[PDB]
Every structure is written in C-alpha cells, then in structure tokens.
Amino acid sequence: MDDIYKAAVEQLTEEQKNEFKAAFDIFVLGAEDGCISTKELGKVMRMLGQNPTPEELQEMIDEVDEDGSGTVDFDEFLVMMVRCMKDDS
Ligand SMILES: [Ca+2]
Hints:
Layout: H1 3-11, H2 14-28, H3 38-48, H4 54-64, H5 74-85
The structure holds calcium ion.
Residues 65, 67, 69-71, 76 line the site of calcium ion (CA).
C-alpha cells in the first residue's frame, strides 16, 4: 500500500463523494451494520451505471480490502472505484 492510491481517493472532487455517498447508503440499506456487501455489488454497480463482471466484484474488492472484513466500506468502497478509474502505469 504505497502513498499513491491513498492520494487517489483524496484527489476525488467534493461532488464525487457527495453524490456517491447517497447511493452507498442504498446498498447498506439492507446490510446489518451499514456497509455495501459484495454479494449485492453486482446490482449496486448495475444501477450505478457500471458493468463489473461476477469474478471481478469479489476479486477487486477482496484485493482492495485491507481490514480483511469482506464488506466494502466508504474506505475500500472508494479505492475500488478510483482503481478502475486509474489502472496500469
Ligand atoms: Ca473490507
């Protein structure tokens, strides 16, 4: 975990986390603690306007997950987005 991605999540604009913060609450609307589970991620992205595959959902998530929790919180949830936004070198 270098200091490159950490800045990628902060570089986001205030309007980016403002609108996404709303949808995020839509996936946790069913969760028990208030987080977006990877199981619904597919439906979460399908309506968000994305087209993630079934093997990429958990894969990418389990890859960006650092607290070894399994659910995608605003912390890992954002890193998973900036990832598909900026990949490769
Ligand atoms: Ca996690």
